[PDB]
Structure formats: structure tokens, C-alpha cells
Design an enzyme around this catalytic site. Structure first.
Site, PDB file in Angstrom:
ATOM      1  N   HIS A 168       0.806  -1.216   0.000  1.00 29.03           N
ATOM      2  CA  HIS A 168       0.000   0.000   0.000  1.00 29.03           C
ATOM      3  C   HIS A 168       0.845   1.275   0.000  1.00 29.03           C
ATOM      4  O   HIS A 168       0.288   2.367  -0.122  1.00 29.03           O
ATOM      5  CB  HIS A 168      -1.031   0.008   1.149  1.00 29.03           C
ATOM      6  CG  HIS A 168      -0.457   0.119   2.532  1.00 29.03           C
ATOM      7  ND1 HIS A 168      -0.546  -0.909   3.449  1.00 29.03           N
ATOM      8  CD2 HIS A 168       0.120   1.155   3.184  1.00 29.03           C
ATOM      9  CE1 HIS A 168      -0.003  -0.526   4.592  1.00 29.03           C
ATOM     10  NE2 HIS A 168       0.416   0.721   4.454  1.00 29.03           N
ATOM     11  N   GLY A 179       2.536   5.655  10.184  1.00 28.55           N
ATOM     12  CA  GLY A 179       3.953   5.647   9.921  1.00 28.55           C
ATOM     13  C   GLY A 179       4.649   4.358  10.303  1.00 28.55           C
ATOM     14  O   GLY A 179       5.739   4.091   9.802  1.00 28.55           O
ATOM     15  N   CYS A 219       3.746   1.256   9.555  1.00 30.95           N
ATOM     16  CA  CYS A 219       3.591   0.204   8.569  1.00 30.95           C
ATOM     17  C   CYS A 219       4.965  -0.157   8.045  1.00 30.95           C
ATOM     18  O   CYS A 219       5.772   0.672   7.884  1.00 30.95           O
ATOM     19  CB  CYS A 219       2.633   0.606   7.462  1.00 30.95           C
ATOM     20  SG  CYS A 219       0.924   0.669   7.926  1.00 30.95           S
TER      21      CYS A 219
HETATM   22  C1  LIG Z   1       0.580   2.367   8.467  1.00 30.46           C
HETATM   23  O1  LIG Z   1       1.147   2.371   9.451  1.00 30.46           O
HETATM   24  C2  LIG Z   1       0.790   3.469   7.568  1.00 30.46           C
HETATM   25  N1  LIG Z   1       1.917   4.149   7.755  1.00 30.46           N
HETATM   26  C3  LIG Z   1       2.240   5.140   7.009  1.00 30.46           C
HETATM   27  C4  LIG Z   1       1.392   5.539   5.908  1.00 30.46           C
HETATM   28 BR1  LIG Z   1       1.915   7.019   4.809  1.00 30.46          BR
HETATM   29  C5  LIG Z   1       0.242   4.865   5.679  1.00 30.46           C
HETATM   30  C6  LIG Z   1      -0.101   3.779   6.513  1.00 30.46           C
HETATM   31  O2  LIG Z   1      -1.260   3.074   6.299  1.00 30.46           O
HETATM   32  C7  LIG Z   1      -2.300   3.599   5.525  1.00 30.46           C
HETATM   33  C8  LIG Z   1      -3.258   2.469   5.380  1.00 30.46           C
HETATM   34  C9  LIG Z   1      -2.897   1.319   4.636  1.00 30.46           C
HETATM   35  C10 LIG Z   1      -3.702   0.216   4.493  1.00 30.46           C
HETATM   36  C11 LIG Z   1      -4.944   0.266   5.120  1.00 30.46           C
HETATM   37  C12 LIG Z   1      -5.802  -0.801   5.020  1.00 30.46           C
HETATM   38  C13 LIG Z   1      -7.042  -0.829   5.632  1.00 30.46           C
HETATM   39  C14 LIG Z   1      -7.404   0.235   6.382  1.00 30.46           C
HETATM   40  C15 LIG Z   1      -6.550   1.323   6.494  1.00 30.46           C
HETATM   41  C16 LIG Z   1      -5.299   1.341   5.847  1.00 30.46           C
HETATM   42  C17 LIG Z   1      -4.432   2.480   5.998  1.00 30.46           C
END
Ligand SMILES: *C(=O)c1ncc(Br)cc1OCc1ccc2ccccc2c1
Ligand SMILES: *C(=O)c1ncc(Br)cc1OCc1ccc2ccccc2c1
Lengths: 290, 292
Positions: B41, B141, B143
Site C-alpha cells: 500500500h 507511519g 507500517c
Molecule cells: C501504516 O502504518 C501506515 N503508515 C504510514 C502511511 Br503514509 C500509511 C499507513 O497506512 C495507511 C493504510 C494502509 C492500508 C490500510 C488498510 C485498511 C485500512 C486502512 C489502511 C491504511
């Protein structure tokens, strides 16, 4: 989201853990620059511990009676001295992995990470508080002596010296014990109290994480009955940022803790947690990196 | 003595953490040999319902910024494996440890090195819940932070998302539980307690002098009680893995099962066990033997 007992990343400290041997006695040491720090009781026989005269015992020991191994290689000792309860063994090789570091003597209530070590090798890392009675509630087996506690530039604050008949005591890195304890095998820790300002910090962490169901001279009257440390205005000023983050004034949170003390989960614990500082909460809740 | 929730030392994993940026999105990646691993993602603006293949098509190697400290790695290839991105870079990570990718089983524990912008923030010990979530500490952040066991570093987890307060992610091949990497509402199963871990912890307690709860039963009788209290069924495999603790304590596994049944039926009465007022299930029998 979420709250956990979080330790500092331990990499910078693992590169400083050596194995110090003197006679049969082997324990852990901290190799920084051209000096290796370890508990002075490394020079004690089993019979010596009962009542050691350290200066006499050390005088009977020479530089070569000290075997310092860093992993596989054996460092050469060119000097030795005793600073309070630690032994300083000067070596011929600065540690190339020496981090930026300082030695710090922490105060009761403050927390730190312990890298628990046996035979110079890391075993595990966990977060700890210096208790008001200057013990720590750790996980320390025979052989773990010399492991260090620290915050992160690495500020070393604790070296492990002894397991008491199940809490633990030790020194700062200048060798002065935290508490009334001495490095001698005789029975020796007064009444422990709960770290109030830390419980309040953790309640703010709870509100930050959505757990809000539980939402001064007067408050100390209550806390004193429950063996809680008295709360001072310094403690109120420390909680200022948490109050401004949450929109809940400090005396309002204390009012909440009063009811909790009289009436008896928060962040998935069934007890009031006092091993998180206000800095711990901000650090974990705003993601400070190192 | 004493008994702490203990993480693995994190230096080997610290050396593998990098920052990966794609457009605006920055998160953490894991750099082993000449490949950087991160959540796919990273390429999403989107995210309510992303078509990952079609979003990937619009991306070239130079759309991926990978920084390892101050050093900018050059990306010479990119591919999607399940839910993780694999970025080929031109330099093998000198600090690569001996490592494996493993898929752990529900109830196994691991250590998480929480990271932001590719830099370590903290380490803590976690368990894979029976419903395949983890109850972690993850901010936006984080992830890309990874979970691992050490023996050789065994990577078992990479963090992908926070559900509407618990956490979900993948193994290092990118296979998630039932979760998908999309911002839709998603339900984890009902969670249950990891019985064999509770028992291990009761053994830990006895090794450390907490005996007050020692009070027999049958595997089938205990299991009937475990089911009523949302406890994982106990199997003979579980009993076998507890053997060494039984021999150390001289307490038969089915005897410990009866004490726990009593704890389950009578509660704790305001007492504590190893400083806890609840039954702890995030220690495996191995965790207990390792620490003790
Ligand atoms: C996650 O920690 C994270 N960190 C940094 C950023 Br720029 C974006 C992040 O996640 C966004 C994200 C990705 C996948 C998802 C799936 C289902 C619900 C919400 C998300 C949010
Ligand atoms: C402690 O970490 C340790 N590891 C290995 C050995 Br061979 C000995 C160790 O300390 C034992 C010790 C030393 C001094 C004491 C003074 C007072 C009470 C208990 C002790 C225990």
C-alpha cells in the site's frame, strides 16, 4: 493505537557487552572506549562474598588475573582500578562499536531498558522502573550480573549487581549503589510505594487510546493511605503536556485516581500501572525515533 | 528470579530497517541482501478500494525512493508478491544477518521493532492472537515494521494496518487472518485465550514462588470448562510441549489444568499472579524455559 511496555532498541548496547572472567567467577562487562566496566564482586570467591574486604582482595589480583573476551577475541588488560563498587579494566583496544554515551544517575520513578546478558551475550530486553525504595523488579538469573540499564546517545544508568531474597539491586556506572545495599552476601529493601505521577501518566495514555470509562493537598491525603508517593507541583508541571494533549486538567485526573483507589480493565490491565513515565507516554504515543 | 515480558535483542533487525517513499507515502522497509520488502500500500493515494495491479502499472523504479540512513539506494526492479512490494536495489545490505521467513502459528509470540521513517522507536514482545490479530502499539507511519524471533533471524510479521485498536499484517511473503489491505470495515473473529500459554505462565509462577493457586481433572473435563470461558481447547500436543516444565516443577500437567479450572470458575479474588491481576497468555512454554 495501542499501548505496550516498550523498550529502547538495544543494538547500540549489544556491541558493548563483553565477558569478564576472574578465577572461577565470570560475569558481564560493558566495553566503552579503552575501558571495561563490571561489578567489583567479580574478584570474589564464594567464601569471599560473605564479607569481602575489597581493597585487600583486589591487591592480591594483577592485570593478568582478568580474562576479558569480546565475542571470540580476548582483549589485553593494561590497568585496573576500583571506583566505588565497579571495577574499571583498562584495555589496549578502544571498542570500535562504542556509541555516543554518557553515565547518568536516575531518580526513583524513572524508567529504563535492561539488556539482560549471560556470558557476554544478549538474552533479552525489557523496560524497568527504579522503585521508590531503589530496587527494580526485573528478570535476573545468576550470571546476569553486569548487565546494564539505559535510556537512548546512550545514557547508561544501571549495572546489575545482586539478586535479593526476588528483587534486584545495582549501581550507576560510577559504582554507587542505588539504595542502602552493599555488595556483600548478607541479608539486606524498605517499604515500596507506588509512583503516583507515573500512574497518572498511564491514565492519560489510556484516554489517548480511547479507554476513558474512569473519567491536591486533598489528593495527597488519599494517596498516603494507599502507599502512593505524594504528588508535588513539579509532578503537576511534568504532566502539563499530557493535559494539553487530552483536554483534561491534572487535578481532574487526580480526582479520577482517587475514586479508583477507593473503589477498585484499563489498557488491558486489572491493576494501576506505575512503570510508565510521562515522557514514556509522549514518546510511545507520538512515535519518537532514535 | 522475577519474570518479565521480554523481547529479543533487536540489533540484527535494526541493521535492516530502511525508509521507503513512493509519491507522498513514506513507510518502513526491510532490506536483506539486495531486496527491500515493504507493504504494497506504499503506492496508494485510493485505499478505499485500490486496484493494486493497475496502480503498480503507473509506477517505475525511480518512483521508489529507498533511504538507508543517509544513503540513497538505487532501485533497479520492483514486483508485487501477494500484499508486499519487493524492490530490487543495486547494493546488498552489508549488515544482513542470517535469516529465514517463517509463518508462525496462532499463539506463538514474537518481538516487534516499531519503526517510523525507517528508524527504530522501540521493541516489545507480542503474540499472534488465535483470531490472527495482534494487540500492538502502532501509529501512522509504523507500517512496514517487522516482527521476528531469533535463534539466525526468523521474520514472521510485517505490519500493514490498524483496524477500527488492534493490528493486522502479513508474513514476509505477503500473505495476511481474513484481512485485506483496503480501508473497508473488517471483522476479526471472536478472540480466545491461549490455554497452553496460560499454563506455561502458571508454571513460570510456580518456579518463581507463586504457589497460592495450587489446589485434578481430565483433558476432556478441562476442555469443557475451557470452551465455556473462551479458552483454546487443550490437545495432547500441548500437554507434550509442557512436559519439561512439569518435570521441573513436579506438577502434573492435568494437575495444573485443575488449578486453572478453579481459577477460571472462582476468579482470582483480588489476588495477583506474577504481579498480574489477570491470567497472562502471551508467553509460550518455550518463552518460559528460555527466560527461566
Ligand atoms: C501504516 O502504518 C501506515 N503508515 C504510514 C502511511 Br503514509 C500509511 C499507513 O497506512 C495507511 C493504510 C494502509 C492500508 C490500510 C488498510 C485498511 C485500512 C486502512 C489502511 C491504511
Ligand atoms: C549476578 O549477576 C551474578 N552472576 C554470576 C555470578 Br558467578 C555471581 C553473581 O552475583 C552473585 C552475588 C554477588 C554478590 C551478592 C551480594 C549480596 C547478596 C547476593 C549476592 C550475589
Amino acid at each position: 493505537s495501542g499501548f505496550r511496555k516498550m523498550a529502547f532498541p538495544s543494538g547500540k548496547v549489544e556491541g558493548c557487552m563483553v565477558q569478564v572472567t576472574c578465577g572461577t567467577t565470570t560475569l558481564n562487562g560493558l566495553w566503552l572506549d579503552d575501558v571495561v566496566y563490571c561489578p567489583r564482586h567479580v574478584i570474589c570467591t564464594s567464601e569471599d562474598m560473605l564479607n569481602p574486604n575489597y581493597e585487600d582482595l583486589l591487591i592480591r589480583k594483577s592485570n593478568h588475573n582478568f580474562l576479558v573476551q569480546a565475542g571470540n577475541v580476548q582483549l589485553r588488560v593494561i590497568g585496573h582500578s576500583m571506583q566505588n563498587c565497579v571495577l574499571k579494566l583498562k584495555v589496549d583496544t578502544a571498542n570500535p562499536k562504542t556509541p555516543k554515551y554518557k553515565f547518568v544517575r536516575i531518580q526513583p520513578g524513572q524508567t529504563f531498558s535492561v539488556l539482560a546478558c549471560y556470558n557476554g551475550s544478549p538474552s533479552g530486553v525489557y523496560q524497568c522502573a527504579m522503585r521508590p525504595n531503589f530496587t527494580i523488579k526485573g528478570s535476573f538469573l545468576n550470571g546476569s550480573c553486569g548487565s546494564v540499564g539505559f535510556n537512548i546517545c546512550v545514557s547508561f544508568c544501571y549495572m546489575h549487581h545482586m539478586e535479593l531474597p526476588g528483587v534486584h539491586a545495582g549501581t550507576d556506572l560510577e559504582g554507587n549503589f542505588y539504595g542502602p545495599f552493599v555488595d556483600r552476601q548478607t541479608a539486606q529493601a524498605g517499604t515500596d510505594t507506588t509512583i503516583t505521577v507515573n500512574v497518572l501518566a498511564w491514565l492519560y495514555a489510556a484516554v489517548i487510546n480511547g479507554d476513558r470509562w474512569f473519567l491536591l493537598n486533598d489528593f495527597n491525603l488519599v494517596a498516603m493511605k494507599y502507599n502512593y508517593e505524594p504528588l508535588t507541583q513539579d509532578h503537576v508541571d511534568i504532566l502539563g503536556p499530557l493535559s494539553a494533549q487530552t483536554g483534561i486538567a491534572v487535578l481532574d485526573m487526580c480526582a479520577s485516581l482517587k475514586e479508583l483507589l477507593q473503589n477498585g480493565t484499563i489498557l488491558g490491565s486489572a491493576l494501576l500501572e506505575d512503570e510508565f513515565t510521562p515522557f514514556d507516554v509522549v514518546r510511545q504515543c507520538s512515535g519518537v525515533t532514535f
